[model samples]
Target: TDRYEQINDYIEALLKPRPDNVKRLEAYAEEHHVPIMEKAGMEVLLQILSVKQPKKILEIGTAIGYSAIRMALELPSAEIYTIERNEKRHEEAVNNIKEFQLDDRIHVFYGDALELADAVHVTAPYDVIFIDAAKGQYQNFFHLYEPMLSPDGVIITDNVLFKGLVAEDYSKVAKIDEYNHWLMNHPDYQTAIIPVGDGLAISKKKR
Candidate 1:
């Protein structure tokens, strides 16, 4: 074994602690299977974004706006547009964003990401594009929103490895494997797969 677990745990242990509300939210998600970003994974994402200090970020999946809030909290000037198709989650996201007084910075959309592209397009050319929704449709989400990113911007995709399922058994997790291969072979983007937090795919335009 390469001690992947040890490495992941070490990195995660050093992450700056979250606020009480965030800690509570994390607990709730773990207990309820809400699928928020993992701590080690999220820290790396944030660290990467912190370097860019992007002014605008578009997130394809707003699972209760937890990730959006986390970003907003870190980037004072960043405005985040996050979309969620689920009705209950959307309501929870709106409420949660309000609770953090981040309603102004984090805009929650209530609809499918594919369908809301037109509306979300109004805020196009985002500096960062985050995809963390339906695993099987990663390609669909990527294609629909890739055009919305600024030329030098980045797309941070979570769960690209599908929790090691792609490597262990590609047949059952064909979609994720397909997406991973697609990202690697994509002509316009320079892609790197970081094996942290179920695996994160960082892609940027070739230019």
Candidate 2:
């Protein structure tokens, strides 16, 4: 058990109820075993988004559109574009966005992020890019999207800590550890790893 487990649970317990559509998606994610951001992670992202108030947001890993939809709700005027490689999740994300009547605001793309990275660039210079995809490919995601971030923009990567395994046992999470090291040492951005909900790495492009 993590030393912070109790504190984490206490904070989560304080989170207010979500909107109906969000609640529905959360339930679906739970029932289907889909990996969505945990409450604490969502709170961190929400706090950042609220302060930044970005006009354009890009997200990798739609995963049934739970996070994308949540982001849309946070910044109603912001345009959100999310990518999902899984066909089934892509379809579900599309449907969920439509159900929330946010189809026009939240765009869903179905394709490999590595291949579509450049294509997504057509809508480039995103104010915020959220990465919650495969663990081993996080480095690729950062490199691909770094050039697409607007000046002063931020890239938020989720699951970097991998259930504290990355810290407690580095060898067990080699890929994630590698990515963490790269992000921390990268000269183009200033990075910080916060221990909240599997850990969040926030990297902001240096001016």
Candidate 3:
């Protein structure tokens, strides 16, 4: 039984692969002193993409478009539209998108997420929506982006657990903690926050 347990744990770890782009993105983030999602977080994002195989994706944050491009490469046919309010980050995302030659499939919008979510609509319904924007604004984003998702669509909200501080009162860590609480109790969707990475909340439309 002990041997079997060890093998099961090993297999669980082995099921996740460290993709080269993810490593390069981490290195790039460090070299540039920019924050990036960690390996565990990136793996979880990749798993969502692999499973959903979304035809249309909407990303709330375009942090160098690393995650967007990764998903694009995985699902070559999918189209991704990402929003970044920061001009500097938008420039970085542009360079990264061009470097990956995903300019055609990945569109970057430079504006507030709340406004963009209302105005922007992909030609097809969004099967996957990745939210990595401002921590304080996720609750707003949830309300904004929910309508754009397709029936039975998947919405992946990252960094909700806030390194295990979500248990604190929302008034204390209103930005992240409140968002986590909102997602957990959201009425129209079903969500669960996994312990991997900073913490991820994967939500789906309750069909």
**At residue 196, what lDDT does model 3 achieve?**
70
Model 3 lDDT per residue over 84-174, tens place: 8889879988988897789999999999988875557644468888888788888888887878889979888888877666765545256
What TM-score would every model get versus the actual structure? 0.95, 0.97, 0.84
- For residues 83-150, what per-residue lDDT tens digits would candidate 1 score against the true structure? 99999889889999999999998998899988988999997889999999999889999999998899
lDDT of each: 0.90, 0.91, 0.79
lDDT of model 3 at position 160: 83
Q: Once superposed on the true structure, which residue ranges of model 1 sit more than 4 Å away at CA?
A: none
Model 2, range 1-207, lDDT digits (tens) per residue? 556888889998999988787888889999999999998999999999999999999999999999999999899899999999999999999999999899999998889999997679889989999999999899999888889999989999999988888877554279898999999999989999999998999999777
Better of 1 and 3 by lDDT: 1
Residue 166, candidate 1: C-alpha displacement in angstroms: 0.8
Model 3: lDDT equals 0.79
Worst 10-residue lDDT window for candidate 3 reads 2-11
Q: Point to the candidate with the largest lDDT.
A: 2
Error of 2 at 152 (Å): 1.0
Q: Give the candidates in order of TM-score, highest first.
A: 2, 1, 3
